[PDB]
Design a binder for these strands. Structure first.
Ligand SMILES: [K+]
Ligand SMILES: [K+]
Ligand SMILES: [K+]
Ligand SMILES: [K+]
Ligand SMILES: [Mg+2]
Ligand SMILES: [Mg+2]
Ligand SMILES: [Mg+2]
Ligand SMILES: [Mg+2]
Ligand SMILES: [Mg+2]
Ligand SMILES: [Mg+2]
Ligand SMILES: [Mg+2]
Ligand SMILES: [Mg+2]
Ligand SMILES: [Mg+2]
Ligand SMILES: [Mg+2]
Ligand SMILES: [Mg+2]
Ligand SMILES: [Mg+2]
Ligand SMILES: [Mg+2]
Ligand SMILES: [Mg+2]
Ligand SMILES: [Mg+2]
Ligand SMILES: [Mg+2]
Ligand SMILES: [Mg+2]
Ligand SMILES: [Mg+2]
Ligand SMILES: [Mg+2]
Ligand SMILES: [Mg+2]
Ligand SMILES: [Mg+2]
Ligand SMILES: [Mg+2]
Ligand SMILES: [Mg+2]
Ligand SMILES: [Mg+2]
Ligand SMILES: [Mg+2]
Ligand SMILES: [Mg+2]
Ligand SMILES: [Mg+2]
Ligand SMILES: [Mg+2]
Length: 86
RNA sequence: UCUACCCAUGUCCAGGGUGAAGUUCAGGUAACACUGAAUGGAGGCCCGAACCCACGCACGUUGAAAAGUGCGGGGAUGAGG
RNA sequence: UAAGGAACUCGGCAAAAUGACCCCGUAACUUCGGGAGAAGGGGUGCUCUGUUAGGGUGCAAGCCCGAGAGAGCCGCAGUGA
RNA sequence: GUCCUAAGGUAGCGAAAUUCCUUGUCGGGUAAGUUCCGACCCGCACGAAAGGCGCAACGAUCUGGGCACUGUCUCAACGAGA
RNA sequence: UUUGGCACCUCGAUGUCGGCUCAUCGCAUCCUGGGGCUGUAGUCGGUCCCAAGGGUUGGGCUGUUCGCCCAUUAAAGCGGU
RNA sequence: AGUACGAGAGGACCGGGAUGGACGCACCGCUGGUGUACCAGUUGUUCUGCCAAGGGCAUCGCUGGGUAGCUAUGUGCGGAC
RNA sequence: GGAGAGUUUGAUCCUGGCUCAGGACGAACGCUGGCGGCGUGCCUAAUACAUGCAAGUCGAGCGGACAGAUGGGAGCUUGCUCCCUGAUGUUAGCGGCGGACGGGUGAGUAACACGUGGGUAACCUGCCUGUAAGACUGGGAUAACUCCGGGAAACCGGGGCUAAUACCGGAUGGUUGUUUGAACCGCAUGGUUCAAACAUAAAAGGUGGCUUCGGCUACCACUUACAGAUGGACCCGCGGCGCAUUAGCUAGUUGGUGAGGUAACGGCUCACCAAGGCGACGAUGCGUAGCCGACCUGAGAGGGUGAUCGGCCACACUGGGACUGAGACACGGCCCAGACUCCUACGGGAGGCAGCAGUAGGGAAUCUUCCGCAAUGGACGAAAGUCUGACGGAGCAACGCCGCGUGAGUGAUGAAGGUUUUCGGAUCGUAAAGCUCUGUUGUUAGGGAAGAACAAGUGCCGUUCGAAUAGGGCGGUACCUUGACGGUACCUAACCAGAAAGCCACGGCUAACUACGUGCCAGCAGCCGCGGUAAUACGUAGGUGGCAAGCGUUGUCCGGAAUUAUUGGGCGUAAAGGGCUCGCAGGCGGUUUCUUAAGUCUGAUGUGAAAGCCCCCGGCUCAACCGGGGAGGGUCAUUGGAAACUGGG
RNA sequence: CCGAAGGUGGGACAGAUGAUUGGGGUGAAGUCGUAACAAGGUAGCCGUAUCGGAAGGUGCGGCUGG
RNA sequence: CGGGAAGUAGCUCAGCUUGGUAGAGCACAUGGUUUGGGACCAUGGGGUCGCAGGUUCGAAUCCUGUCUUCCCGACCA
RNA sequence: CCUCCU
């Protein structure tokens, strides 16, 4: 940039994204664990995965990444699959 | 007995493609036109071996041969061989 | 056969290049048939899914034909001559 | 106007498979084009079934220009066989 | 070296234009070397003299020789065989 | 030496030095070319009984490389004094 | 609430064009030019840009340098030095908010972009202000600073550290999801309210004062729910461009089903199915264009425009993409590509004037490289304040509109003085000659604006919190303070009406003539037309109606033009009946009665911003201007009637 | 995987320009004839054909606006 | 390159071949004409013969050079 | 058969 607070906002936002991507990745990985568990026929693990998923989901909401409606949509999708197993 | 043309009588032409007329059905109109689809299988039609021809080049030129060979080339259901 | 690429030559003569199948796509002009394989592009091996879908034959068993997909694997290159 | 004729060449095309002069002139294409294409018309010496002018398709036809392609060439080198 | 004149060799054959390949010779010198004169200030030139050692381009058009043109070059010589 | 010369424009001789073009000689260390008794990949079919691994033929089957040798477009040197 | 005129003929009536008088403007060009007050000023090249400036702030988040010194210390030339970290200050760097606003331009867009229409049951909604729970308990890293290595460099990578109101762990959290049922229902998809379980999810403290040093506070402020509000998103009816010498278009195209994505509904994306969708009521294509409030014109219907000013939209050197978040898929960011500018010792960096000024270029043509945040509004902050080319001012330019003027008034020589000539004149002309009276303004010196509300700082008092008298905040209440313009507007007072009149037109339309010089020449011309040796329209010279420092000329639009005719025209001979049928669609349709109620009509309710123009219109001395209450505004909803007529049975 | 820019290709459309060529308009006093307007000296005009320097002529059919 | 032919007023041409004379048409100017024109009629002005040299008593004329413009010719089998 | 321009 050619402004002081622009150069800060350049340097800031890069460092934010890295940290932010972590939590999305963590969430998406935690979502994959639940999805993977449906194939293997193992509800007991899927519940314990869904908690860790739900934690990682809601951490992104706090930071300001996943919208409350976005989170609402995900936890819906997962819970229907878990109940659809039994 | 070569060759030109003709006459009688035989015979040959691997394969593949294209898709004329007609027909049927559907649409279509007062009738016809006309349209589509399917079917159909025309042609000195197409690509291409055999076969027939002989366009280009090279070679050969006291030749392997008094007209050929090699590599390409043209026709190849026809006014065909 | 380096680099170049018709500068050669009367003249690209000769040679090189193109070349199969499937798919996409294809202008002027036209006698409405054509032009047309116009042009220009893409795909092409092998393995598994797979004795695939589907088809022929058969009472079946079996034998034969066989797309199109998906996932891979290898090479400089798969109509590998 | 005048002379001559049987009648004086229409349409179309034209430096042409025809044009001597001639590489006509102008334009196009090329760095450069006696060839080629388009124009023009002083047609030496086109011209209407010894047809005129066009024309899709067709051609081992002739001509000019491109892309590709190459030992055709710059300029030649090596290898195989006879 | 031209066009010719003559008709002497060759009509029981002296292949005939241009190009390609290979040159070689002359000098009336295109370039380079050396000079004189200049209407030679310089840089360039002009003109004549000496000099034949070596050098003297690739293309477009045309069968062309020649020529014109493009682009170069120190120069793009003229002739004989 | 922007010296001489010239109003300027321009712009030398003579003398130093560097580096080319064309031409020639040699040579393969380098860059490349070729390299049919080198190495490798690969198609079809056929043979070594079969598998695996190989051989034959298909332009050296084709394709990618390549040693020596021979080579130019490559390198060195020459026409100096 | 609506005016015509000239011009076809020898003359006529008609048809028919042409031209003129009006108004308008972002104007340009001539010639000319005094001042003032409001307004306006790249319409061309969304061309390229030298230079400067246009968004920075919070030290009461922050460790840290670097200062401060109230004091002790301080060797001692009283000259200078100092050793401790004073209250606290300056705040590179970290963290927060803003930077998505404000400002600019209209390139693209024929589209739910816009103007008038819904879900809000398809959404979102930080900040602000309420009502409703909390900041409890885990640490671990990292800038700066330093150490090391780079970079001539520009810029930067490692190492050990340190902080934070930066970040992450865990409990319990009404939100959220899931499930278990209810309650209650709508416009189908449903929605709203309640209860338990399972799962998940919270914070942050920095200031000043008081601590009984247990803590308890309070402005600020961190975090959670139900609100309100605000600003966005999607969807839809209906509207508003040209060309058929553009007739077929489409293949995620049209619908389904499923999956995914999205704040959100949805071919929005994809998989798998079908075969649809659109179009003569104009699809598709091409062209042109931001739309609207409005603006110009007109009796109105209409027509044209969409500079300035307000709203919606779109864009930000060209093009693509996401990140951050409540919110850009960024106007002074980044990532990548491209064309241009800059730097680079060549490895690599930096930027986008459609921000204000300015430059070049283009062009008929459009400003100052200005001063100030005093005012208004922002951002930041608790505040002081800082930043603000937004904004206020000023510069420039007759580019508009208009001021109130540039006097009033007494005064007949009709003088002076003019160009004509029937050698005489006549009009300007009560206007000046000679004045003589007043200060709208200004000719020069003295007074002097308003604009300023203040915000705070301070002093006080009711209220609510307060362990509380702390100590602040919020209602009434003092005191306090600041002006770019600018010593500028406006007043007084002289020198004094001195400084302040103009331009254009004068055949006719449309109120306004003669000498001379040309001689179809030179020239003129909106139209009709003038000039060939007596030119009331040409060259010159002397002479006069409108509006008022300008008005002529050219350009554009509406009018006149009942001249595209719905209002409001035509087709025997002026332009105009298809050569004539058969007919698809379409348009139109006898009489009665019944019924219907789409059209038709009608009542009631909601919106159609602000400005502008306008009805009453007021205020500012009237103005060249600002406020309120109305009205218009709809082929518009929703609902209740009426039912003759048109339509349906 | 998608994907801007770029590359390649064959078409579509629009503008500019082009040797030359075609009519058209305009232009005080050019050349040729005299076609039309009168029965315009062959009544004219419409469609069509053909011919001719040029207006035009001629055929066929039509019209009266003879 | 060689050979021809031109070159005369503003423009187009005679005169050149046989030496003595500068003409013609159009344009230009003036007059006539007419209201004024146009056309027509009459009357003028305007070169020194592309440039230079030569021969001659004397050169547009004959000879040469030069410049400009045309025309013709220019292997060979 | 024709009858210059204003
Ligand atoms: K050639
Ligand atoms: K041919
Ligand atoms: K002989
Ligand atoms: K070698
Ligand atoms: Mg055949
Ligand atoms: Mg064949
Ligand atoms: Mg053969
Ligand atoms: Mg080669
Ligand atoms: Mg090569
Ligand atoms: Mg050649
Ligand atoms: Mg050659
Ligand atoms: Mg060949
Ligand atoms: Mg030529
Ligand atoms: Mg060639
Ligand atoms: Mg003949
Ligand atoms: Mg004959
Ligand atoms: Mg003899
Ligand atoms: Mg003999
Ligand atoms: Mg000699
Ligand atoms: Mg070796
Ligand atoms: Mg080698
Ligand atoms: Mg094997
Ligand atoms: Mg064998
Ligand atoms: Mg064999
Ligand atoms: Mg636009
Ligand atoms: Mg009207
Ligand atoms: Mg008539
Ligand atoms: Mg009529
Ligand atoms: Mg009729
Ligand atoms: Mg007549
Ligand atoms: Mg007659
Ligand atoms: Mg005749």
């Amino acid at each position: 940039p050619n402004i002081k607070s622009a150069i800060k906002r350049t340097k800031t936002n890069n460092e934010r994204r890295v940290h932010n991507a972590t939590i999305k990745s963590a969430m998406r990985t935690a979502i994959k664990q639940v999805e993977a568990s449906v194939a293997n026929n193992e509800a007991d693990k899927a519940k314990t995965a869904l908690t860790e998923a739900a934690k990682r989901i809601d951490k992104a909401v706090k930071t300001g990444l996943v919208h409350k409606n976005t989170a609402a949509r995900y936890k819906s999708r997962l819970a229907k699959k878990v109940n659809g197993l039994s």
